[PDB]
């Protein structure tokens, strides 16, 4: 809405309490959606004169898609809202407007990969509350999107091309966050529970299990077929359904959403050890969902009008 | 180096409470879910309480269901176990333990597939 | 609620010999099923996850098989060391259980 001029503002993405009040209380919903189109079909017949053209309705499919969620500053407080587009979440945004409510957010449970989210204006960004802290989250936001084909069947299609071109942006970011001349090396996590090890997210009511190991696992800076097939589990998982109060909302059914999706943006862990091999190690992570609220409410905070 | 180390044990009275605590390290503690085993004396190995990673999915036997209570700090890297209630049949050597990962062998979901390292143990002592 | 069985309860073998617990489940497990020794005054070590996986750093003489109801531990060579409790343990789904009391394995010299 209205952009401050002139003005200088401090935030902090980490002692931000958006992120903790939507965690608390911020469900998926879906809608009815109708994706309409027409198909002309020429009336040839006999014997190749074709005058005249069939216009027929089709795509009559109805799926549900997730209903865009805003956050709204209480009366008396507004939203203030970084506008430079590539802000660290910590320190002075030179650019800064007041909203009335956050952009629209489409929450989805996930680690690992952050689906369906949004993506950096400029350059691939990589964030994290403390890039000394190796126990601290590296959040990635993507400047374009990869996309990633999820079945029923139990498996997911991500184009290796792409794939290899995003690893390869974010390993330069790596290289750029943690010496200019250091091997960036991706490899699988080191273990724990399934919504830890693997790709782990929801689609409707379902957990999609996605085993991740062809995804991370190359080396970078240190002088196959077309299509990535990841191996799915899926699963009901009733006790994360959203409940309010006396009322329980099941989610559309497996044939309702599209399991597919844009992958926007990773969660990484970097290694310990501090070997100065010159050369780091990164892995999948994910588990805390504040982390992947983190990666879309960096640039607000809330603030009291006067 | 997986360590795990038990600590709280000692006597406590027919009706009383305990609470004992597991100090973790050598893995990243948050991402493995835990679990709670008790063996009384000469006897075999009883499976008590299971907590996952996020700390919110939690798992009791029948034996000690209502009485006791586990939980974990992801903060501080320990796993705990509040037994309320005590009878002389909660007399036992109590071990924490770490659940296996999903391990690249496993080709589905499950809720647990079962303990990997153990602690030494701590033994609780119900008596007057 | 799964019930687990071992037999023997306990038995006698002399050093070298082959020794060959099995375990049994009241209902279809697939494979998940784990072994463990524990040895006098310790804490249980896993040796076998999910049937006829060995675990790290555990001696090459140390293999299991089975799947569905009826399970088998073997220690190939049997070694002064070996002497320990077995038990096994099912995990398809908690309460997690086993053989109470498991399996006591003594040298003969």
């Known amino acids: 809405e209205v952009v401050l001029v002139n003005v200088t503002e401090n935030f902090n993405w980490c002692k931000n309490d958006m992120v903790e009040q939507m965690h608390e209380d911020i469900c998926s919903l879906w809608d009815q959606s109708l994706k309409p189109c027409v198909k002309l079909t020429p009336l040839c017949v006999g014997a190749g004169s074709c005058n005249t053209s069939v216009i027929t309705q089709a795509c009559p499919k109805v799926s549900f898609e997730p209903i865009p969620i805003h956050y709204c500053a209480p009366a008396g407080f507004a939203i203030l809202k970084c506008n430079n587009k590539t802000f660290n979440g910590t320190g002075p945004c030179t650019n800064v407007s007041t909203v009335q409510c956050t952009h629209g957010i489409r929450p989805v449970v996930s680690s690992q990969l952050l689906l369906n989210g949004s993506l950096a204006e400029e350059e691939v960004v990589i964030r994290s509350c403390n890039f000394t802290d190796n126990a601290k989250t590296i959040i990635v936001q993507l400047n374009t999107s990869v996309e990633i084909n999820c079945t029923g069947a139990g498996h997911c299609n991500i184009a290796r091309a792409k794939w290899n071109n995003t690893l390869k942006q974010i390993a330069s970011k790596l290289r750029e966050q943690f010496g200019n001349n250091k091997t960036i090396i991706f490899k699988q996590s080191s273990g724990g529970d399934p919504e830890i090890v693997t790709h782990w997210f929801n689609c409707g009511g379902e957990f999609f299990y996605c085993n991740s190991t062809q995804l991370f696992n190359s080396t970078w800076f240190n002088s196959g077929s077309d299509t990535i097939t990841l191996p799915c589990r899926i699963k009901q998982i009733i006790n994360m359904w959203c409940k309010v109060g006396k009322m329980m909302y099941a989610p559309p059914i497996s044939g309702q959403i599209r399991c597919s999706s844009n992958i926007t943006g990773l969660l990484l862990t970097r290694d310990g050890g501090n070997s100065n091999n010159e050369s780091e190690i990164f892995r999948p992570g994910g588990g805390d969902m504040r982390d992947n609220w983190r990666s879309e409410l960096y640039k607000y905070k809330v603030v009291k009008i006067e | 180096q997986v360590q795990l180390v038990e600590s709280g044990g000692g006597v406590v009275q027919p009706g009383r409470s305990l609470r004992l605590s597991c100090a973790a390290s050598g893995f990243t503690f948050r991402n493995y879910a835990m679990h709670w085993v008790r063996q009384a004396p000469g006897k075999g190995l009883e499976w008590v309480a299971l907590?996952?990673?996020?700390?919110?999915?939690?798992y009791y036997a029948d034996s000690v269901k209502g009485r006791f209570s586990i939980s974990r700090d992801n903060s501080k890297n320990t796993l705990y176990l509040e037994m309320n209630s005590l009878r002389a049949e909660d007399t036992a050597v109590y071990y924490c333990?770490?659940?296996?990962?999903?391990?690249?062998?496993?080709?589905?979901?499950?809720?647990?597939?079962?303990?990997?390292?153990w602690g030494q143990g701590a033994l609780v002592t119900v008596s007057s | 609620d799964i019930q687990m069985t071992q037999s023997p309860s306990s038995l006698s073998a002399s050093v070298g010999d082959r020794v060959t617990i099995t375990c049994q489940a009241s209902?279809?497990?697939?494979?998940?099923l784990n072994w463990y020794q524990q040895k006098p005054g310790k804490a249980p070590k896993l040796l076998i996850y999910?049937?006829?996986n060995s675990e790290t750093g555990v001696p090459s003489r140390f293999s299991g098989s089975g799947s569905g109801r009826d399970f088998t531990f073997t220690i190939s060579s049997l070694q002064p060391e070996d002497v320990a409790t077995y038990y096994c343990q099912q995990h398809q789904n908690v309460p997690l259980t086993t053989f109470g009391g498991g399996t006591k394995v003594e040298i003969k010299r």
């Open positions: 907590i996952k990673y996020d700390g919110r999915n939690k």
């Open positions: 999910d049937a006829s």
């Open positions: 209902q279809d497990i697939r494979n998940y």
């Open positions: 333990a770490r659940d296996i990962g999903l391990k690249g062998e496993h080709y589905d979901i499950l809720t647990a597939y079962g303990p990997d390292y």
